[PDB]
Design a protein around this ligand. Sequence first.
Ligand SMILES: COc1cc(CN)cc(OC)c1OC
Length: 166
Amino acid sequence: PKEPEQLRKLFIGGLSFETTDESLRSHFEQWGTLTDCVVMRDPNTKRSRGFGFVTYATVEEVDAAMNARPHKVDGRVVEPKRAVSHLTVKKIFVGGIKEDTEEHHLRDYFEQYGKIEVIEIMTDRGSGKKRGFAFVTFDDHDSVDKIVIQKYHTVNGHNCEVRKAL
Ligand SMILES: COc1cc(CN)cc(OC)c1OC
């Protein structure tokens, strides 16, 4: 059955004030079926508030739209973000990896969410022993947004806790 609507929505900031429901739809329909498409407007003046949202039929379509950034809509580069679960960060905390998880375990798993720039496996300041958690920094926030909405992360056979960092 259908993924929850919240996970199929993209909020689009930075719109041209000339963008309409129709022009936003014509743009974003290139990456999937849109079940909803709205430009937010002032209730009295009807002047655009400069943001809106689109709702796709599937999560894979959201992924396709995000992978097609940057989006220039009606002459202006816009800022799409998945709806909140916005705390826009590029770094995650990964906990529960114990002492046998290495850099390549984290890279092999997380590289499929986005381009990794830093992997930091935490070690004890005094002894050098692994503390059982790590931080991963990506080149872009959408990787993190995809990661933190998953119910489960299994890395090196460990069930991990993953959260947005800083
Ligand atoms: C003004 O822009 C945004 C508005 C909302 C409203 N929920 C959410 C957003 O991101 C999830 C935005 O940034 C694109």
